[PDB]
DNA sequence: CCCCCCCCTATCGAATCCGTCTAAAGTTA
């Protein structure tokens with residue numbers, strides 16, 4: 033319906049319209065960089081601006097609950113350790129799909 | 142006590158008439 037498209041457009045806006053770091057957790061494989069490039073072109077036309085906006089987007093793959101927990105705990109630890117600094121922090125993190133990695137566990141007794 | 146789905150079938154039933162054309166052959170004082 034709309035979930036991945038809305039997430040991608042919001043991430044593109046936050047990465048370009050505010051100049052902040054954003055992490056994306058893609059689990060179902062629903063993230064193509066061509067869509068992000070199209071959205072950025074729809075926003076602005078400078079190539080270096082698009083490259084800099086893309087450099088603030090980090091994508092990680094986690095196809096089960098354990099990998100997702102590992103990457104989230106790694107982010108927690110690194111941010112809690114890096115509280116002294118004031119640059120490169122992540123303000124928005126998007127999980128592409130939580131049902132993908134949770135549904136296999138459920139079902140039964 | 143907990144959380145998610147399935148599938149097509151089978152033929153029926155007849156109606157309605159129209160429009161005319163072509164003449165030929167003399168006979169017996």
Ligand SMILES: Nc1ncnc2c1ncn2[C@@H]1O[C@H](COP(=O)(O)OP(=O)(O)OP(=O)(O)O)[C@@H](O)[C@H]1O
Pocket residue numbers: 033034035036037038060062067129
């Ligand atoms: N130019 C375009 N590029 C990409 N998607 C487009 C475009 N124009 C329209 N769309 C729509 O974007 C939708 C993408 O769906 P999306 O992946 O965001 O939904 P979803 O609910 O998160 O899906 P899923 O359950 O498969 O993860 C398509 O249904 C398509 O109709």
Ligand SMILES: [Mg+2]
Pocket residue numbers: 035036062
């Ligand atoms: Mg999707």
